[PDB]
Amino acid sequence: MFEGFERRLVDVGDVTINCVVGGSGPALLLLHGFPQNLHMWARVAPLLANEYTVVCADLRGYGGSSKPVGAPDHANYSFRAMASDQRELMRTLGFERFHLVGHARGGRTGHRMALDHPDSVLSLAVLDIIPTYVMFEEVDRFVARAYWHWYFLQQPAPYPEKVIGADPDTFYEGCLFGWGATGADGFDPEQLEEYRKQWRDPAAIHGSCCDYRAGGTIDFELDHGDLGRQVQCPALVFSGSAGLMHSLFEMQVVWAPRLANMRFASLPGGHFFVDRFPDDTARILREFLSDARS
Amino acid sequence: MFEGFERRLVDVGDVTINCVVGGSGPALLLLHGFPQNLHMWARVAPLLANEYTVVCADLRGYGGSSKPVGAPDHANYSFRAMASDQRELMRTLGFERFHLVGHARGGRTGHRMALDHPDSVLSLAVLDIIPTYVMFEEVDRFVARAYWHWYFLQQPAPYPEKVIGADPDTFYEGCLFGWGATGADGFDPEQLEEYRKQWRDPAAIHGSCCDYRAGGTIDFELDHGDLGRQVQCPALVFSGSAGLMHSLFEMQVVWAPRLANMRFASLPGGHFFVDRFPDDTARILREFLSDARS
Ligand SMILES: [Mg+2]
Ligand SMILES: [Mg+2]
Structure with a gap:
């Protein structure tokens, strides 16, 4: 995987970020979600590397990046902290400005990055996410049942750690196949x-x-403090139309108040659609990035 | 435990209900909750047996009772089905009418029994519960986080079964100590x-x-279909004032429209307060039952 890409472990302050870098052209940062890592981009990244310098990085807590013990107030795992790591990674690699594509947790990281440092983010693609604020504020019995992990994973350490730790494969396969609505064959x-x-x-x-x-x-x-602010750069809301969130919310409705320049796309998969549709994911991203640059 | 009580496995139709029966006087059915069984009453029941014929029974799915495979629509595990078992148990034991005290799942079973067959239930005590309808209809980010298990445990079989099965002690201890807010020493x-x-x-x-x-x-x-109906018999809403539900909702406000003749009591424990405060639980129930009979 990632043939021709350089593998790097980069100190970005108090953490080290694991990444791969390949291609040439404008910088494109790809950020994964849960329970995955930069390898979700193993097929997408080489496809886009003909036109972009593609950086795929592991979020703090994930993959090969630092995983500090969580602070009592969880502040060292905020999307603000996660975004700071990734912005600093890009700077260290020579990129003051870059396109950003984020799935799930990486999309949330990207949204926060664009709010905190708008000048660094040339375009923003958020893949299969409803805004964090909306997920919680508009929770109902259907949303809580669908994305049950939003509540289980909040339980105080070490309880979820120990439950998951007893059989991680069973637990996380249920994330992929269950709430993730993505069949094993994909x-x-x-x-x-x-x-x-x-x-x-x-x-x-x-x-x-x-x-x-x-x-x-x-x-x-x-996020509550930032309600009413819109990201100004070109943005893409890119969902899995066979996923749970595409059907309980209208992607366009929840994102319009947050994105001034919004485009939409979908693929007929679940939350983990990038795994099943890498070529079509690359196609849609390539078109969006071209539009964003025009 | 339950010295002097008769142990019985009673066929009630398509299931067998495990119970213990002791004492003399009017019938008093005690129904447990999750993740417990009739042994939650091991200290309370002998105390009340000087005035009541106390029956402590295991709900279907629990303890020593039948545990059929769940139907695709879950109807064989409804509170209606659970209540039918327990009403039939009491009938087989010679009691057409009885007082009913239920904790958690047993309280929900009791509420449903009083709605379905009001003539059978002389009085109803519901211990540390918010009505099912309210739990779901009024869910918010706080309620969903507090009682996260209401969402995890709904995930399709065999996923929760396998996750729990990998380390049941960790999983269920977290129920007692976490959302149950009842310290181990209790x-x-x-x-x-x-x-x-x-x-x-x-x-x-x-x-x-x-x-x-x-x-x-x-x-x-x-429950939705029965909104606006009131249980007419004397009722007791009996909560743990140090528990999560007592503070997230007002017990008296959520129950008042459902119960025409409501009394309220609390003990300074969590959800599993009966474990820590058996003598005081018996005291409060005894006073309520005396008042109900008057
Ligand atoms: Mg975070
Ligand atoms: Mg039920």
């Missing part, structure tokens, strides 16, 4: 094994739980 | 060991998951 064996390595790492189990703990506290509060 | 070791036997029983893991699956579907729908 996953490439090589990429799936990279996810499995992380699933079995207790430090990653903890880091990802802390991400969710922050999600329901510090992130919710920061 | 549990009698003898009672705890009987809970633990059930925790490790795969048939009980499944049965209790099905209870929650019905809880969010058939039970919610049946």
